[PDB]
Amino acid sequence: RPTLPIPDLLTTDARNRIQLTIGAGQSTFGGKTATTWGYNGNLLGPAVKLQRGKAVTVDIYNQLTEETTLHWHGLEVPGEVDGGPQGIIPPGGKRSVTLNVDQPAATCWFHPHQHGKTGRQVAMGLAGLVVIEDDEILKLMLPKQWGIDDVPVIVQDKKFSADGQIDYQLDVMTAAVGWFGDTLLTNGAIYPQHAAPRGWLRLRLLNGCNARSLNFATSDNRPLYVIASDGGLLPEPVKVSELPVLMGERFEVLVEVNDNKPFDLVTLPVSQMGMAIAPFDKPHPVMRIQPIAISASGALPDTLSSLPALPSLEGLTVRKLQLSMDPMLDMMGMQMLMEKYGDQAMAGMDFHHANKINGQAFDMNKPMFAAAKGQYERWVISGVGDMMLHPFHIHGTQFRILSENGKPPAAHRAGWKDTVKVEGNVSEVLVKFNHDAPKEHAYMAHCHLLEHEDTGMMLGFTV
Template identity: 45%
Template sequence: MAGQDFDFCVSRRLFLAGSASAALMAGISPRLALASDRPALPIPAEMRADPAGTIKLSAQASTMNFLPGVATPTYGINGPYLGPALRVRRGDTVNMDVRNTLAEPVTMHWHGLEIPGDDDGGPAEAIAPGATWKPSLTIDQPAATCWFHPHYYPSTAELVLKGLAGLFIIEDDDTDRLPLPSTWGVDDIPIIIQDRRFNPDGSFFHRFNLAAVTVGYVGDTVLVNGAINPVASTAKGWLRLRLLNGSNARSYQLAFSDDRPFYVIASDGGLLAQPVRMNSLPLHAGERYEILVDARDGSAFDLVTSPVMQMAMNLPPFDQTLPVMTFSPDGAETEGTMPDALATLPPLSSSQDLQTQDLKFGMNLDAEGMGLFMKAGLPKMRAGGSTDPEIAKAVEQVILEGPDLTQEAQLSANNINGVSFALNKVNFDLPIDTDLRMVFSEGTDKMLHPVHVHGCQYRVVTVNGDPAPEYMQGWKDTAAISQGGTVEVQVRFKHPATAEKPYMAHCHILEHEDSGMMAAFTVS
C-alpha cells in the first residue's frame, strides 16, 4: 500500500522456509504426506454430477492461513480458496448450479469448453449476490484439462486473485484406453500455479494503478494449489502432471531441478498426436499442459521456474531460478506409462482463402504514462541476468505506490483493434461451422499478451511466421504474442453466440482484460 514500508525480501524468505501452518482447502483431500515443516501439496477433491446430473457450486468468502499465524481474506468455490476438480465425460449433459453467496456480482466462465454463448459465462451473465445461475452444459469435445473462473467486468482480476478458480476435467473413451497414469493425487497430479503478494496485514495486495494496467499483477510469492513451497509425496513411476497457470499475469519457464526431461502429452484442449520431449516449458497465464515425467528412480526433485522475458516479472525472487514445489516419489510403483502415440488430430485446412479475423492488442497509455516505467528502468531488466537493486526498488515502488486510476481511466487503458471493450457492444461477427483464420498481433508496446478465445479450441499454425513448435500443435485456446510478434491460428466455431450473450476474445492478463483489452463477438 502507498506510504508503507514493504520488506523487499519477506516473501522470498517465507517461500524458502515454507509454512507448516498453510491450511488445506475445504474439499481438498490430504492424501500426500507432510514432509518436515513444509505443507503437503493440497489435492483438489474430485467432483462429479449427482444422480440427477447436477453439479452444485457456491462462491463464498472465507480466510486462509498462507503465512504463519496470519489469516488472509479469501474467496473460494465450495471452500475457502480455489475449488474442486470437476469431472465430466464426453457425451454428458451436466446441469450446473452456481450460487453466489458473496456481497458482489460474479460470473462463472467455463474456460476451454466448446459450448454456446448462452452457457459460456462471459461478462453478460452476471450472477447477483444471493442469486443462482443454472446453465446446462453438453460436453462434446476430446478429453482435456480445462478450468473455470469468474469473468465479471471489470473485476475479474480481483475475483480470481482472491481465489475463485478450479479445474474442469473432461474424460473420454479414447483417452481411457491409453495406459496413462490415472490415480488422482498419486500419479495424476493437478498443479495450479499462482503468484501472489501479501500486504503487511496478510491480505492480498492488489491495486488498479498504472502498473496493473500496463504489466498486470506482479506477485512475489508462488502458491501451488493454494500452498507455499509444498511437497508432493507421489507414486514411484511415471507421473502425469496437469499444469495450469492460474496467475493473473505472470508467465513461467518450468523445468526440473535435476534437468530431467519430461514429455508434453496434452495442451489446453486435449492430447497431442504423440509425446514431445522437452527440458523446459513456457507456461503463460490461462494455459494448461499435461506432462509425463519419469520418477521410477525414486529420487526427490523440484519443479522450478526460470526468469522470463516479460516486463517487471523478473523482480526478486523471480530474478533467478526459483523452486516452485518438491516431488518425493516414495510411494508404491504404479502401472501408468508413456504411450508412443496419443491422439489422431484432424489435418489443418490447406485453403488460402479462409476468412481472416485480425486481433491487434494495444495500449492507450500516453508518453507520460509509459515514462514512469522508463524512469523505473524496466528496459534494463533482462531475464536471466542479475537485476540492479536500485532499479528493482524503483520498479517495486511503481508497482506498490503508483497512482490509482479512476474507473473511467482503467476501462479505457487498453484496446483490441484500437477499441476498448464496452458492455453491450459487439465488435465483430463470425460464421458458424466454418474454417476460419485468426491472426493475433501486438502493437508497438512490445508487451506480452496470452490471447484467449471463448467457445472454441483452435490450432496454432504459425508463431512469428514460423511453424508452431511441436508442443503447441494440438488443441489450444490460449496462445501468447510478445515483442511485436504474431500468432496465426485456424478455428471452427461449432456453436452460436448472440449479441445478448456473445463470446469474448481477450488478453488473459486479467488486468489487461479488465482495462479494455477484450472484444465481444457473435457467431451465427
C-alpha cells in the same frame, strides 16, 4: 513442507447436478490470515469431471456480496452458458447452466469473468478445474489415480500487504504490465511436497497467474514429456527440458519418479517485463516431488491420438485483431515499474479504457463482429506497436496455431489450443465455432493478462 492440496474430483449426483458455492473465507500464508475467495471452500476450487457426449447441470450459488460470473475456460459450449461478463450471477443468487460436453478429453478450468474486475476476482482466490474424459483417453492407460500419480498443479503468484491481506490493485502500473507478486502458490500452498509412486507421474499444469508467464523444468534436469495442451492430447509425447506456460494455458506432462531421489518442479526466469524481480530472478521452486517406493501403473504410450490435417487456407474468412495500448498508459506504467524496481524490471528483456482491440476498448453492448458457425476462419492477432506479453484467448473453441508470434508453433504447441502468444509480433490461428452465441451472451476474445482485459483489451463476438 505441507502436502500438495488436492482439489476434490466432482461428478454429478443422481439429479445430474453439480453444486458450486462461491464464497469468502480465510486462508493462511506464512502464518498470516488473509481473506480469500473459493469455490466449495476458502480458496481455489474443485475439479469438475465431465464426459464427452454427456450433459451435466451445474448449480452455481454466489455467496459473495458482489456480482460475479463463472466462465469455463476451454469449453466448447454456447454463449449462453459461457459465463462471460454478461453471465451475471447476483450476490446471494444462483444460476444454473447445462453443459453438453462435445470435445475431446482435456484439462480445462473455470474462473470469474466479471466485467472490469476479472483480475481482482481471480487474485482473491477464485479458480477451479475441469477434467474432460472421453472413450479414447481411457484406453491409453496413462497415470490416472487422482491425487496420487495424476495431479493438478495450479501455479499462481500473489503479493500481500503488511496486514496479511492480498494486495490487489488495478492501477496505471498494473494496467500496463500486470498484477504480479513475490509469493508463489501451488494449489494455494507455498512450496508443498507431493508424494508420488515410482514410475510415471502426470502433472496437469495450469498457469493461473493474472499476468506472470511461467517456464517449468525440474531441479535435476530430468525431462518432461508433454502429452496434452489446452484442448487435449497431442498426437505423441513431446520431450522437453523446459516448458513455457502462458497465463491461462494448461499442459499435461509425464515426469519420471525414481526411488530415493526427491526433486523439485521449478519455474525458470522469464523474459517478460517485471517478472524477473527476486526471487523470480532465479529458478524458483514450485513443489517437491517425494518418491514413494510403490510401483505406479501408468504408461507413456508411443502414440496418444490423431490430430487432423490443417485444412486449406484459401477462401477462409480472415479476421484481423490489432491489439494496442494507449501510448500514455504504456509509458507511464512502464515508468512506474522501472522507478519501483529499477533495471531488474527489464532483466532478460483514463487507464480504465486505455487498452484496446481494433482501436476500441471493450464494449459489452456492442459485439465487434459476427463470426460464422461451423466454418474455419483465420484470425490474425497483432501486438506490433508495444512490447508487452499478450496471451490471446478466444472463447467457444479449441483452435490450431498456424503462426505463433511470427514463427511456426513448437511441436507441443501445434495441437489444440485456446491461447496463442502475441508479443511485439503477429500470430495466426485457425478457428471454428461449433456453437451459437447471441449478442446478449456473446463470446469473448481477449488478452489473458487479466489487467489488460479489465482495461479494455477484449472484444465480444457473436456466432
